[PDB]
Amino acid sequence: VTLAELASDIQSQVKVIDTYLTEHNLPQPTFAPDSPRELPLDANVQRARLLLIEKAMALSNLAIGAADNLRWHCMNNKFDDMTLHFLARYNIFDAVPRDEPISYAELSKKVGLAEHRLRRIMSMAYTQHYFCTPKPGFVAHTSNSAMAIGDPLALAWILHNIEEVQPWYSNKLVDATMKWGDSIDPKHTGPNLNAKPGEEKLFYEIMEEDDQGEWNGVKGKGFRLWRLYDTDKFFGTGGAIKGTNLLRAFDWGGLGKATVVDIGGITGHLASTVALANPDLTFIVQERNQPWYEKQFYEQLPAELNGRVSYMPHDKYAEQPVKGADVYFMSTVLHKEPDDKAITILRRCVEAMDPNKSRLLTRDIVMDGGDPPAEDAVINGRAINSKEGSYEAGLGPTGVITRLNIGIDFQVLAVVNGFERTREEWVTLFKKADPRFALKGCIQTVGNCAALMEWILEE
Amino acid sequence: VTLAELASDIQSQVKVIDTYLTEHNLPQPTFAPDSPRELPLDANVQRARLLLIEKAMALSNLAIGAADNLRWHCMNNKFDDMTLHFLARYNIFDAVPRDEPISYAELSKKVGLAEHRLRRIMSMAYTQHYFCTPKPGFVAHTSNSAMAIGDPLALAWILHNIEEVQPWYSNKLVDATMKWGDSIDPKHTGPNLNAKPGEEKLFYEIMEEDDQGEWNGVKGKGFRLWRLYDTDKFFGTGGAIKGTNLLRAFDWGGLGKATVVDIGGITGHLASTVALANPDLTFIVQERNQPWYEKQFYEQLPAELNGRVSYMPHDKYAEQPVKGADVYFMSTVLHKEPDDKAITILRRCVEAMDPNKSRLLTRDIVMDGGDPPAEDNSKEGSYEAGLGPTGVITRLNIGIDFQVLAVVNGFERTREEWVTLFKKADPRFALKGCIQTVGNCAALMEWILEE
């Protein structure tokens, strides 16, 4: 491919998006804080958007060229993370007003970071369109930075990755690999490279046990796990994996009055999203208890649910105490479970299921892609705006959903030696758990990176 | 700005490059291993390239959108570094033939990385156009990965950043700032967060003293410093800061038969670059000695220079023993020197200079940009191509600024700050030339002492 080819391709995708926005009188994305934070969920718009990102990344990459790509990458990339690190730890998102500029001098005194250094940090932020400088000596928000205003979930995501995942695990992954090999054992992770025998610590042990700190309402023991919970919530409130996409991937209303057992459901945020939109549904959120868990679970629980979402302490490897429920639901649980452990969990589900009225629903990455809703299956336009060679938009070796899915793969690899799976690998795994399992649906909304898989037991 | 405006801008810039390559019968950049590694150095082409990169980055950013930008960023960007870390530590660039594909199985056996994990690592590389998969189960190079084949300097750059700068310094820079504030003391850096007063370790002490390892022919003491020197050479052999750009930024030939004193000139690589192109020049490379320095200096030294480039052990803060030389030259030395230290060095140069004969040349970032070479239609906006708040040369300038900030609390300067600093060293100093080739982030500043 050439620069010109990429540019033409880009133009084609922009035209699809730009025409949809105009024909529907929808505001255009910009870098201003009042920009829409996403494009319409229309499947044609989203396919075009995913291809556009991919081609624009290819274009900047090609134009930088082979001589400067590795040179500039190892110089600059790491400092985009460092910039966000400063922005979060100094609370700079909240200190810059959303709709008004602020001087470096005033910003410096608000956050306690000297003017010279502040100026330097902000300048790097500008190059990735986080904040801008509208006039000399002044800082203002962009859309990218404004979305973090007042949102500790956004800051949780920054700090979890920069203060835990990267320094403790991913920076050490090479060493981990050479020491223990290609492992599925969560002990074979960065913090244990020099641990004495029997003194290894698991990621989730560190998260729940460390008591030297505090985060967003939880002081002491488990503050890191609470922050990790915030990150989970962050991915549900907006963007590609937004929780409301679950409502489009399965007919929750069709269940009628029914009980959903939410196994490994964190703090029940996703359960609350589904139950808010489906008044006939009861959710049992099953999770390992913590000293602060119930206090936080009920503080977040919307009163409008009238108690339909409740918490039940439960070990996911143990016997399932809720028998004959309509749905047993696991959202992004099994990608941290190697085969033997996932089979244990699945067999616990099977024993509690009534094969003639229970379903097992999982939400997880399907590496090679799920299927779109039936209404989006037929391609009604041109292939250029819908597919990249043989791959659905967003997939293939340079696809942005492919990229994100590898990012998630690497994250669970880093912290627990987890891994993502293809559809065939999911079906193989479930049938090893019980040969009666059948994949009845595998729905991935366009622009999402996860699929909702509907499993049943048939004779 | 909107998606359509960005796309429109991109088309214009592309057209400039596309037209020039066609009209000059020059191969088009692609991702194939045989692609040109850079665009032509013609100033109009480079201006369009810099704007094109900037607009294309704006376009991918805007298309990702505000909801997904921070979410995707903190998920993915760190693993682009981790992928390069695997590729370097397992020597995968060399393991994959430049012009043939290799199966994951065969690559796995060559590098000793299990197949499943190998596949996973390679797949992340593909998304940034490092390697590709031309057929199921097979790996091939791209232009981006092929440039690292057989080049330990590229591996040096990967490992210096990922195994030293990032974990020891930049990841700890917030903690360092909260502990010491906006310090300019090189002891007030990440490794010393819990050091006893007086027991702080300097970055360059760690570099020259650590003996637990080896790198590219240097075993034991100072292997890290030798690898650092490889990274400096890496930025001289190609890309934006290539040493041959120095030949366009100053009239070296106009010096005639002349001596250049190269203060802090590393292992003399840059000196050799200039001396190979200018046969009438003699270079004196002044640098702090190391047990392996002279061996490595002479191994590297091109035979065809016939001794014109020599090594003189020297403390840059000490009296300058070469009096009256035509040129005293410092390349990317002063951006690691706070004002007081820089003034000490500059006054050592002034004492040795003949004001009517000697020049002082410095190569450094000028944060607000130098002037184009003399040999190079209408201007819109406040900034030359590559500069301004989203410019890609600005971005590289800041990355370098942050690099020296991280390891020694150094900093980059504007042209006005340079002039102020030099005039504080000696009021006779005058900036006679400040030349920055288009596509380069550094400028060559020519200083003289005037009455």
Ligand SMILES: C/C=C/C[C@H](C)C[C@H](C)C(=O)c1c(O)cc[nH]c1=O
């Ligand atoms: C399939 C999508 C799942 C949404 C999650 C936010 C992905 C994220 C990588 C994740 O699972 C993490 C994790 O499991 C453990 C530690 N740190 C994480 O970030």
Ligand SMILES: C/C=C/C[C@H](C)C[C@H](C)C(=O)c1c(O)cc[nH]c1=O
């Ligand atoms: C102005 C351009 C200079 C070219 C250099 C390769 C820049 C690079 C950031 C650098 O100076 C480094 C340094 O001084 C010390 C440690 N590690 C570095 O990387």
